[PDB]
Amino acid sequence: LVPVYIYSPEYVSMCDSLAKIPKRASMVHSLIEAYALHKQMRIVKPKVASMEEMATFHTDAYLQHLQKVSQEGDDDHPDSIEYGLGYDCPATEGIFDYAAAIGGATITAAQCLIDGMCKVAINWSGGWHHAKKDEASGFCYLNDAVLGILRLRRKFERILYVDLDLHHGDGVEDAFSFTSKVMTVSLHKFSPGFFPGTGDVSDVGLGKGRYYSVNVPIQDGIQDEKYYQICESVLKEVYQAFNPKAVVLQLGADTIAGDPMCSFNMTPVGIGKCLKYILQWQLATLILGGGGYNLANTARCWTYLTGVILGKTLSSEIPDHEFFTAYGPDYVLEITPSCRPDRNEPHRIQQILNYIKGNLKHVV
Ligand SMILES: O=C(CCc1ccccc1NC(=O)c1cccc(C(F)(F)F)c1)NO
Ligand SMILES: [K+]
Ligand SMILES: [K+]
Ligand SMILES: [Zn+2]
Incomplete structure (x- = not known):
């Protein structure tokens, strides 16, 4: 009944070493630790994923190339x-x-779930949902989300993947697009140009997996109140229809107000309400992280979200810790929405939601 928190020092230091996102793993842990939240969770050291574990989704040719590049580096290798x-x-x-660490941590989280050690397992340094079996994509080298769903499939016949990152969870969806055993649900920005340019509402899945992919295309500037209306509308139908035995939940914090992506206008309370709804099942x-490029805001979010997993209520004032200066000028936990318009027209949202209601009527 206590949640598992997947962490070691060596795991966090490796997740800090991916450029374009420096010291973020550390910042998240540092703030979670400063609120004394680790003291109410079970700290479990992640194992490194083996080649065989990693190869349950990925092709050997890809993993082997990824291994080579890691020793050398791009020169003398135009096959990249x-x-x-x-x-x-x-x-x-x-x-x-890094790939192996990340995949190993998500796999270790899934094993804790299978063993009955917990109802909730957390790997905030995971959530790398774009990676394909034989191709890196959108800054994802290895699809840990997929590797965890497959590990979960040993104990749990039906699995639900709910992906709340700003980007469409395309790599995870594609892995399971032809099966009814895993349902993928995704709320994302979907606009011409925007990555990865898939996951329109009409993306419903193929063959035996038809209607077992669900996608909510959303436009810029959506805020907490409206997102939760969309989210619990879709998730209420999905629970009754699919009836999942287990849940994998990607909570990418690149949807948050103040992110470089500057698309959605969410706060961690908005996401937290979606998280509570999944927890009450x-x-x-x-639990997985993912995108999140305003590093302080990402820690604010994922720290807040850990509190709700625990049922705790955190103080507004940020605790003093290693990265205290990063939380200025106000030094608070709460995030204020940007003053931009919400481009989601109500009629367009309602016809998206009714389409999904209808697709879920087919699920047996
Ligand atoms: O959001 C993602 C993956 C990120 C991504 C996908 C496709 C194209 C670009 C990106 N990310 C960035 O360009 C990015 C991320 C963080 C920081 C920056 C920087 F340029 F501001 F540094 C850029 N997955 O949910
Ligand atoms: K998403
Ligand atoms: K599916
Ligand atoms: Zn993203």
Whole structure:
């Protein structure tokens, strides 16, 4: 009944070493620790994922190339482009060890769930939902989300993946697009140009997995109240229809007000309400991070979200800790929405929601 918190020092230091997002793993843990929240959770050291574990989703040719690049680095290896490495996914040294750490942590979280050690397991350094079996994508080198769902499938016949990152959870969806055993649900920005340009509402899945993919395309400037209306509308239908035995929950904090992505206008209370709704099902629940590029706001969010998993209520004033200065000028936990318009027209949202109601009527 106490949640598992997947953490070691060596795990956090490796997750700090991915550029374009420096010292973020550390900032999140540092703030969670400063609120004394680790004292109410079970700290479990992540194992490193083996080649075989990693190969349950990914092709060996990809993993082997990823291993080579990690020792050397892009020069003397023009084969990189084939496997998704490039500017978006730098082919820098040490990444196969990061890949393995991340996949291992999500897998370790899933095993804690299977063993009955907990109802909730947390790996905030995970959530790398874009990676394909044989291709890096959107800064994701390894699909830990997929590796965890597959581990969960040993104990739990039906699994629900709910992806609340700003981006469409395309890699996870694609992995399970042809099966009814895993339902993927995704709320995301979907607009011409925006990555990855998939996950329109009409993306419903294929073959035996038709209607077992669900996608909510949302436009910029959505705030807490409206997002939760959309989210619990979709999730109420999904619970009754699909009836999941277990939940994998990606809570990417690039939807938050103040993020470089500057698309959605959410606060961690808005997401927290979506998280409470999934928690009240009292199912085995694997919690994952993901995108989150205003590093302080991301820690504010994921720290707040940990509090709600615990049922605790945190103080507004940020505790003094290693990265205290990053939380200025106000030094508070709460995030204020930007003053931008909400481009989601109500009629367009309602016809999206009714379409999903209708697709979920088919689920047996
Ligand atoms: O949000 C993501 C992946 C991120 C991504 C996908 C496709 C194209 C670009 C990105 N991310 C960035 O460009 C990015 C992320 C963090 C910081 C910056 C920077 F340029 F501001 F540094 C840029 N997954 O949920
Ligand atoms: K999403
Ligand atoms: K599916
Ligand atoms: Zn994202």
